[PDB]
Every structure is written in structure tokens, then in C-alpha cells.
Amino acid sequence: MALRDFCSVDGSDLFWEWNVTWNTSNPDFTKCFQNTVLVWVPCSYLWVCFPFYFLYLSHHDRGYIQMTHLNKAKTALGFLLWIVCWADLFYSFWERSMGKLLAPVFLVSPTLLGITMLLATFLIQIERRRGVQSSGIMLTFWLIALLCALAILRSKIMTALKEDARVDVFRDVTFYIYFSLVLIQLVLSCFSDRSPLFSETINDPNPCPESSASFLSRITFWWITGMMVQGYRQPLESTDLWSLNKEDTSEQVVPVLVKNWKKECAKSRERDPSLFKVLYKTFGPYFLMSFLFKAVHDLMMFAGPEILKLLINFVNDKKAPEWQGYFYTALLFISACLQTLVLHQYFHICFVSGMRIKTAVIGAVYRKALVITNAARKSSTVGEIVNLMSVDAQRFMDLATYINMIWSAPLQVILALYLLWLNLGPSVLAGVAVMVLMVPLNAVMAMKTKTYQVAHMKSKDNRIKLMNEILNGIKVLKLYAWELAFKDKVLAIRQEELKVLKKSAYLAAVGTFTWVCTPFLVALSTFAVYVTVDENNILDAQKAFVSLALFNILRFPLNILPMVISSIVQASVSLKRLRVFLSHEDLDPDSIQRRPIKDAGATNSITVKNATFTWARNDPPTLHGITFSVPEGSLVAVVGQVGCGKSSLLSALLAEMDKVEGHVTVKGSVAYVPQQAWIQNISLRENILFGRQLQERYYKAVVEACALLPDLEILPSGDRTEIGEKGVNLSGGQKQRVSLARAVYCDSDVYLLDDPLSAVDAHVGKHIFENVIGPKGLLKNKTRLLVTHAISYLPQMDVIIVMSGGKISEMGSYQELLARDGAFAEFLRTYASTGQVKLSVYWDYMKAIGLFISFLSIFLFLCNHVASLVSNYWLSLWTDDPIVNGTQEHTQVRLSVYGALGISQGITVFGYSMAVSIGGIFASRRLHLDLLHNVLRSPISFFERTPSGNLVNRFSKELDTVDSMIPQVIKMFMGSLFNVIGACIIILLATPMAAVIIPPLGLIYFFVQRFYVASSRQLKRLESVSRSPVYSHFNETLLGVSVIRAFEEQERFIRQSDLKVDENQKAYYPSIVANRWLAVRLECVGNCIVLFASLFAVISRHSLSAGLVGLSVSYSLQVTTYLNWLVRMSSEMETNIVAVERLKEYSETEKEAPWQIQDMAPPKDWPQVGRVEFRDYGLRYREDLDLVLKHINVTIDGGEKVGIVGRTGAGKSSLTLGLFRIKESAEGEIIIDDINIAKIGLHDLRFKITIIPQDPVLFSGSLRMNLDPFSQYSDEEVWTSLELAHLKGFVSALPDKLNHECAEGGENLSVGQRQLVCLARALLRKTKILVLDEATAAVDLETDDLIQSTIRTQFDDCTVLTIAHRLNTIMDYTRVIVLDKGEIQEWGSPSDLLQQRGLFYSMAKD
């Protein structure tokens, strides 16, 4: 009677009774339940949330806020609420003093309500003090209080409306005004007050809105709506992204990880420190909220099927009051909304934690790379140290979203199995077995398609390299007329790729069959066992449609669990890698005693006493007991035998090498120039200043003194000229010169130079020695350590040190070492001896597949979905069957028809997948054949104007995404779209008012994809573009760690790395928030759809059949996942289909003349005799430029040897290009053997003359293929050419006599042998006309002597119309035609040209 007497002294009003609360046409809570629970639940929530929230606020202060009107009103309303709450308490005390007996509840509930109201006021004050603008706890507390007070208000209004019930006017009016105040407090809690007075973000012009967004705007992610609208209205660039939150900046994230790791390493000082412990301690506090939210979402997920069971029971029962269904549908909608909010908060927390982990790891790795010892860095390679940011920190980034799965997915699986066992008996095993047996099948198939993928990509790389080689040699290919052979070879390689693609297509067909038809298979197995095991097993709507809704939510934790565990093991290997790197021994800072230049301890800037060093503890010491001192300002030299240890003394003095024993000290700033130059990917000028103020006078002085002024003239922009990506054109001497210039401009005290002169010749060498470093140099009043192998500059230098195998042989001035003649005696003697993609792109891709295959695929897909819909409707009918004599009739027929429909769906799914995949390979074949033909038919002009990068990208990446990506996107997009359509048609067929709700909610509010699609695509682009520079900077800083450490520039580079990481996160964060935004909106659409389906089912409960209701609600439960899939796949289609537009881009660019036109085929005159003819010819590179060739008229019979002579840009190479009409003759004409070659199809003539460039290119393949791709000539002719190429003996000396594969461009042969092979090809093709365009100056006087003697013996008969600037080889030619100014000067035999002392003789004298 504890609860019963607590109601009243007589215990008349019961605490809970279905008599009034549930089994009645008008529900209402009994007065005890109101006055106890409806007032204890909000008090309980506030008092349980205060401890944790106060602990969090004490650990999280955002400053201070003024007392504005809003907060003053909220405090005043809180105090008024407490006094009005104690009003009824005082009334009850007065009544008890009056003698009237009253219950304990009236004397306990108001007390707790008043104290919790005062608590709310106090916590609102402390929230103001601690700087929170929109309270989350208060909003939910007020919402709970308003809901409970609303229930009590409805009860009280109903009771008062009774014309016989007693009314307690005092308590009624007190509760009325309490309700009004609570409602106004809730409406005020939605607002936000002024920003904190300590808002340091005032300087920041573009802060992240999340810092100052309301709680409602924060759970719905509304604050990114402006960004997503703008991203569709106009393009988004990096200038528009918001600044990061202070808690996300690397300057606030990296130090905590660094400090925690240092603390644990110190603790371990045995047992190796564990990076997992540090990462956990550092990032778990913000990650446990993820566990809480995930648990809440997992629990709320199962509230769907149970409420569906209740709704089905309500529809079947026709004696239950109508409001029960409305209660159920409201409950379902509320649960779905809460679940979506909680899940997306969980995802946000996980993603932000991953972002922070990535930032911290990148920063810690960067800061460690600058202090790792030389042995540690030399253990690994720079490409593997960079991978610590490239892959090893992205794995931690992505695992944060999957780590929680390891406990959530088993929980979901066990809950689903338990509910299935409760709902449908042990026959659930028949479906869980099919689902568990499915995952080994798809894992095996994934491996079997991974092997096919790698096998196809390895075969595709052959074509890709063949492309990268052929386009590089397009001119010679066009010039020989060999394009058909290479077209055929590429086509064969494409055929191999397409076979592999067909096999992968079969695999993908079976895979999508499994993925689509697994739920039907599970349902069939379960229902078959359940109904066949026992006759009394009756399939009802709550057994079938509750089981399916639970099978769907058991599907996901099983299908994604193997991926999660694989990701965990990969992250384990990642963490071991990072732990090994971060545990490396670091340089001992105090081994090198640095002291300020102001110290007057002694007049020597460098001192050393018995110092020995080594690059590793175990390795033997290199420098042995050196002891020397360098007086301040002296110019000291260290010269000795190479490899004897002179080149390591500077590095030892820079603290690079471990100091085993000794005592050395260096004063002042240190400037260092290493032997291997370090150059950044920035402008030459910025590289020279190395981050200092530009003093124009001093900068000019150092650049002119360092002899850089002639160098900046060659490159376009001068000092402003950016070095580009890793030295666009900088040579070794240029690199050393700019490094030295940076060293001088730094203006340090001691200068350690590791032979900056080595890669520089003597002339400008001695120039810079005199101007910058020597006794007359720029820094002649500084301390300089020189290690160099030069002799002539040694005498000027003050005191000289000679090394011997890591020991100090002797030191002194140069006169003294002349006198004693010690080590330097031998040294001188021996050593010195956009918008939306057009629909026409989709249409032309559909044509590329084939309209027949496309129609077949669409027909099969529609058949699949009609089969599935009819199957679900048939299941509904089966569950609608009656119970007669304890058993259901028609059981066998229902089961058989269900099975038949399912197998029809399965075979149809398999068919449509195979059809679309085969059509995809068909399209991939035709598109590539067309692209190749169009490119190979285009003129050379298009080849020079279009950078080769675009063509290789078009052939590799666009073709790859067309072959592999888009056919699968078609699968998934069609699946999602028609799943959504099927759900909608089911819903609106069961209840046609769904047709009313769908327009104002489906189409209109589904234009939220118009913004996400436009904006996320831009944001991911920015993310990748900003992701690359972080790794670029890490590599660039790893290359030059010693230089940075010498100049004391560690802070600058750490700050730059921080900026690069922050710029990448600036684009990464909006992408995550955008995903959350779209997910919230789409799941809101789905929740509303399920609400309306259930609500119209409740309205039409008297006409629906209790099986249609379950079907509609079950499909509505899936609508949300289908919508998310559809939007994501629509975006992934839009951003990826443009590859088809790109692959057909050159389908209309102007092509060459018709290759082979057979209407006027010529006779077999051939060029043999070597005739040359021109009739007022004229050619020009591009018609807007100047005519390089003007009015050439000549007609000479064959059998002659004429060379062509001219000055720079005279018209020689243009004539060579115009010989084979490779450029269309604007004016004039050329006729050979009475054939107008300017008209006939160029293939019909290009094979019937010959030409060879300066360096004729070879190809990756057999020497037989290079000599003849058609291989029509007999191998005896091959050997003929080889002997006339002076190679038969050498070629036979190769392992393969005739088919020895030759590398690209003749790499398998030396450059001299390469030109020998080019001569070999030239002769081998049975040729007449040959040319050496500038080749005379690039070939040594022995091999070109061979080629000349061949023109005397082999091309004695052949006609050579060449251009040799070293025409001394061709003076013996019968005649020479001299041309200049783009026109013919004169002609004749070389004799009278010599005697006339003319222009030709003027170049002859040169």
C-alpha cells in the first residue's frame, strides 16, 4: 500500500488502471499518475543531467556573456515559476493546519518541482557565466516539462469541463499559470543571446558558423544551408570556406599529442611505449559520446518493427479505440526522428575525431622528421616516411567511423536474432543461415574480381605506355605512314583488356544478383520451414512483415562486419608503423655547444678538442680525434683525398653526426650550403631570401656578385621565375649558384661550404670566388670553412687543413706547406695530377552501348521490379488468409507461387546485370576505337597545340572510369530509383491519400539534392587540391632537413605545415557537414513518408486488410535508405558521366585529308632515282603567323645529291615537313613523276618517299617490328641493312639474332648505337630520300664518318636532300640550293658558290 496510500489517505484513486488509461474511448492519466510521474520525470532529468553538465562546463569555458534582456527575462521567469510552484505548497500547509487531511503527494511533488525550477534558473545563470549561447540541456528539459504539463493540462481541462466534477480552483489556477510560464520559457530557450565579450574571433572575418549557431540549428546542421545554396548559385573557391574551429586547428591539436607521447616515453624509461595508449588518452574523451549515441540509435532502431507489430494488431482488431493507431503512428514518427538525429550526431562526432587524429598525427610526424637522427632516417626511404601522412594518417581518419561497429554490429545481430526467435520460432535459423553463408560467397567473389582487376590493369599499363611513347613520336609515325599498324597493335591489347572485362562482368552480374535477391531468399527459407514444419504454424501479418523489417536491419551489421575487421587490421599495421617512426632516437641538441657571437671567450668561432663522430653507434667512427680551431673571420680550407672524411666535418659541426667523445663549440649564426643542392618548389627569388625582408640593394648586390644575372636572362620572368615542380629547367651549376646566393643573403657569421663550386666551371667559378667568398669577396670579413678539391684558389686562403682518412694531418698557411711539403706535396703531385551535364551525353553513351541492349536492360529491370512488387503483394494476400479448423488453406499454392515469383525475379536480375555489363564493354570498345581513329587521323598541329597530358589522361583515366565505374553506377542508380518508385506505388496503392502527400513532400522538398549535388562536388575538389600540397611540403622538407636545421628555420616550416594541413581541413570539414545535412533532410522525408503511410492506414483501418498495412509500413521503413542511396548515386553519376563527353571531344576537331582515296590511284613510279620538284610552293606554320616558305619554283630530274643551306629559322625544317605534305599547301603545288601529290590521299604517297629526323625514334618492341611493323620484307634484307649498318656481327652477338626486343627510343642501344640503328632503319626500308636535319652537329666524327662513307657506297645511288650546318660533310654534293628570308636566294654547284664568295661561302668561312 506504499504507492496506494501515497495517492490518498483512503487509497481510492489507483496509481494505474487500464480501466481509464488504455481501454477507453477517451484516455486520461489518473490523478496520482499525473501528480507523481508527470512531475517527477522532468525533475529527474534535470537533476541527473546537472552533475555531468556542470562537470563539462567547468572543463569548457567560452568566456563571459552580459546580462541582456533575454537572459534577464529567463531568470525572472524562473524565479516566478518557483514562487508559483511553492504557492500550492503554502496552500497545502494552510489546509493541513486548518485540519483538512491531505495526501503526501500534494506535499512532496510541489517541493521537488520548485527546487528543480530554482535549479533551472541557477544553471541558466551559470550557463551565461560560462558562455553558451543556445543551451541544449535547457531546451530538452523545457520540452519534457511542456509535454508532461500538457498532458496534465488536458486532464484538468477535461475534468473542469465536467458539469458535476469538483474543482480545486486554487491548484487549477496555479497550474495554469505554471503551464503558461513553462511554455514561454521553452519559446525563449529556442533563441540565442549575445556572443561572449571575450570573442577573439572578431579579427577573423569568416568564422565557422557552428561556433555561434543555435542548438536546433546544430542538430539539423542548418548552418551550412547558406553555403550549399551559394555553391549552386555560384562556384565555390578556397576564399569562401570558413575558418576552422580553434579546437580543430593544428596549433591546438598537435601539441597535446606531442606532450602525451613525450610523457609516455619518459614513463617507459624495458617496455616499449604504446602509441595506442597515447591516442586513446588523447582522443577518447570526445569519442565516448560516440558510444553513447550509437547505443541510443541501435536501441531506437528496433522501436520500428515493434510499433509496426502493434499497428498491425490494431488494424486486425476492430474493437480497439481509434486513437490507439494515432498514438502508435505518432510514436513511430517520433522514434524515427530521434534515431536520425542521434545517428547523425554520432557520425559527426566520429568524423571530427578522425579529422583531429589525422591533424595530430601529421603534425607529430612532421615535428619528428626534423629531429630524427641520421641512422633513423637512413633506415627507411623518404617515400615511406611520407606515407606516414599519405596513407598512415588517412587510415586513422577513416577507422574512426568504423571502430564502433565492432561492438554495435554484434549487438544489433543478437537483438535481431532474439526478436526473430520471439516472433517466428526457431525457423529463423533457415534465414540467418542463408545470410551468414552469403558473406563467404561475396568475399570469395570479391577476391576473384580483385585478381581480374589487377590482371586487367597490368595489361592496360602496356597500352598506356605504348600510348605515352607513340604520341611522343607522332611526327615520325605520320611521316613513315605507319599509323594503321600501331592502331592494330593497340586494338589487340584492347581486345585482351575487353576479355578480362567480360569475365569481371559475369562476376558482377552474379554479385548484384546476390545483393538484390538475398532478402527474398531469406524470407522464402524462413517461411518455408515455418509453414512446412507444423500445420498449426499460421502466417499472419505480424509474423511476416515484422520479420522482414528485422531481416533488413540485421542485414547491414553482417554485410559490413568483415570490412570493419579488415580496416582494423590495416590500422593495426599503420599504428605499428607510426609507433616505430615516432620512437626513433633524436639528435642530442647539447652535443654541439652553441654560443652567442657577443661572447668574448676567444677569438676563434670554431673550436674542436679530441672530437670523434660516427653516423651510428654500431658503425665505426669516421673522424678520429680531430682537434683544431678556426680564428674569427678566417678563411680556412680543408682539402684532401676524396672519401677521406673532409666532406663529413661540416656535417659533424652541424650536429648531424653523433658525437662519441670530445668538446666542440661554434659561435654566432651558421650558414650552410651542402654539396647536393636543396631547392624548393617556389620562385628563385623567394628561394634566395629564404623568408626574409627584401632589401633591394643588398639582393641586387648578392645576385650580381654570385653571377646569377646572366642566368636569369635565359629563363622568362627573371628572378620572379618560379622553379616549378622540382626544377623545371635548373641545372647543377644553377642549383649550386642559387644555394650559394641564399647562403650569402642570409648574412650569417660562420659559413660552412660543402664545395659549392664542384658543378661549376672555372671561369664563372673564379668569378664567384673573387666576388663572394675569397679575400676580395662579399663576405671577406666573416668566418668561412671551405671543403673543395680546387688547387688554383687554394693559395689565396689564409690557413689550410689537410685530411687523411678521418684524421688531421697538418694545418697551416699555404707558404708553410710549400716549405715543409708534407701531405700537400703528394696532393699537388698525385691528387692534383561545373554546370549540370547535358542529357545528350547520357543519350550518346546509351547509343554507344546500343539502343537494343539499353532497351533490353530497361525491360528486364522493369520486369524485375514488377516481379518483386507482385511477390510482396502475394505475401500480403497469403498473410490475409483465414483460420479454418486450426490451419490455413492454400498453404502449398501460396508457397509455390511465392517461390516462382522469387526465382523469376532472380533470373531477371541476373539477366539485366549481365546485359548492362555486356553493353558497357560494347560501349567501351566503340568509344575507344573511335577516339583512337579520330586522334590518329588528326594533323600534327593538334598534337603540338594540345599538351600530351590531356591525351594520356583521356586514354587512361576517362576510359578507365567509363569501363569500370559508370556501368556499375547505372546498376545502383536504377536500383535505388525504382526501389523508391516501388515503395511509393505500394504506399499509394494501399492508401491513395499518399498520392496527396507525395507532391508537396516528394518532388518539392526533394530539391534538396539540387544544392548538395552542386556543393559537395566542389568541396571534394577543393579537398583533394588542398590535400596534395601537405605531402608535397613534407617531401620537400625531408629532402633538406640538414639545411633547415643549419639555418634555424624549424619554426617556419612547422608553421607552414600547420597552414597546409589547416587549408586541407578547411575543405574537408564542410564536406562532412554537407553529408550530415543531406542525410538529415532525406531521412526527414522518409520519416514523414512512414508517418503518412501509417496514418492513412489507421484512418482506413475498416477497409484495409491488415496485410496491406504491414506491407505499406514495411516499405516506408526502407524508403529512407533508398532515398539516401539514390541521391548519392545520382551525384556520383553526374560527376562521373562527363568522361563520355571528354572521350568524344575530338570527334569533330579538324582531321587530316582522306588517308586512302582509291579513285585516282597512281602507278608504281616510287621515289627511286630521287627527284625533287616545286612550283611556287608556300607553307606557313599557322596562317596568322608569317609565311615560312614563299614561292619555291624548281624542277630537277632524279639521281642528284643536293643539300639545303640557310641561317637560323631560314625555312629548312619547314621544307622537310612540307615534303610529305604533312601541312596542307595553302598555295603552290608539288608534283612528282607527273602526279599532283597535293590532292591524292596522303597515305597513297607517304609510303612512297622517305625521311628521317635528327634522332629517329625507336619503339618498345621487337627490332623486327621496328624495322617493319608489317614484316613484309624478308629477314635476309634485314641482315643486308644490318651489314650496311655495320651491325650484323654486333646484332648476332645479341642473344636474339633477328627478334632482339628493342627498348623505347633506342634505350637498349647507346646514343651512338641509337643513331646507328636509325641509319639501319633508314637503309632497311629500301629508301631513296634521306635527311639529316641538324643531326650533323649531334653525331661524333667516327659514326657519321660511317654514314658518310655509306652515302659514298650505300646511298651513293640514293638522293639525299639534307640540311647540315656542318655542311663540310656534304660539300662534295653536286649542287646546293641556298634559301633565306623564307624564299630562295640562288642555286648552283658548290664550286661557283665558293668562287663567288657569296652568302654560302660566308657561312663556309664561319
Ligand SMILES: *[C@@H]1O[C@H](CO)[C@@H](O)[C@H](O)[C@H]1NC(C)=O
Ligand atoms: C472504469 O472505472 C470503474 C471503476 O471501478 C470500473 O469498474 C469500470 O469497469 C469502468 N467504468 C466506467 C467507464 O464507467
Ligand SMILES: *[C@@H]1O[C@H](CO)[C@@H](O)[C@H](O)[C@H]1NC(C)=O
Ligand atoms: C475493455 O473495454 C470493453 C468495452 O467497455 C469492455 O467490454 C471490456 O471488458 C474491456 N476489456 C479489458 C481487457 O479491459
